[PDB]
Amino acid sequence: MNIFEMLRIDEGLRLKIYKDCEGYYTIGIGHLLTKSPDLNAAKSELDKAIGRNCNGVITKDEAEKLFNQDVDAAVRGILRNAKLKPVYDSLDAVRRCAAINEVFQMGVTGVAGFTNVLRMLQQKRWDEAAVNLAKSRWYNQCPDRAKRVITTFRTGTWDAYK
């Protein structure tokens, strides 16, 4: 499946501001608004992201616009980064999606900082890479959102998304 379909499964789609697994205000398909507990701060961040007055609710079209911007930023981010680009180029199609997903979730600097996992992936040490990812705060603070990505790095199949 494609990266949009994969992230839709991991992140869900919600049109109103909600709290994610870590308690953080989120909207759309995994678009983090703020780590502040102030709902009104999340609303102000949403109005900034869209450029108009939203009162904490967006349309599916606006959700998809944010999603497509966030995916584009992850893909361009990988492909200009001296650590991530050789890893991405080395991976098979399925694990390339898992890499984009991980960068979407953690950010470029978060993924580029896991230099052990990157070496393992480059070297085809899939089991070792998955064990190491399962030690991360990313996974342990919110297992349901990360578990399919980890399985996908291990197996190289789409089975966890079926």
Show which residues are catalytic.
Answer: 11, 20
CA distance 73 to 68: 9
- H or E, element range at 102: helix 93-106
Phi, psi (deg, nearest 5) at residue 113: -75, -20
- H or E, element range at 139: helix 137-141
- H or E, element range at 91: none
**Chain CA centroid to CA 78, Å:** 13
For residue 129 the two structure tokens come to 């890479």
Strand residues in the chain grouped as ranges (E): 14-19, 25-28, 31-34
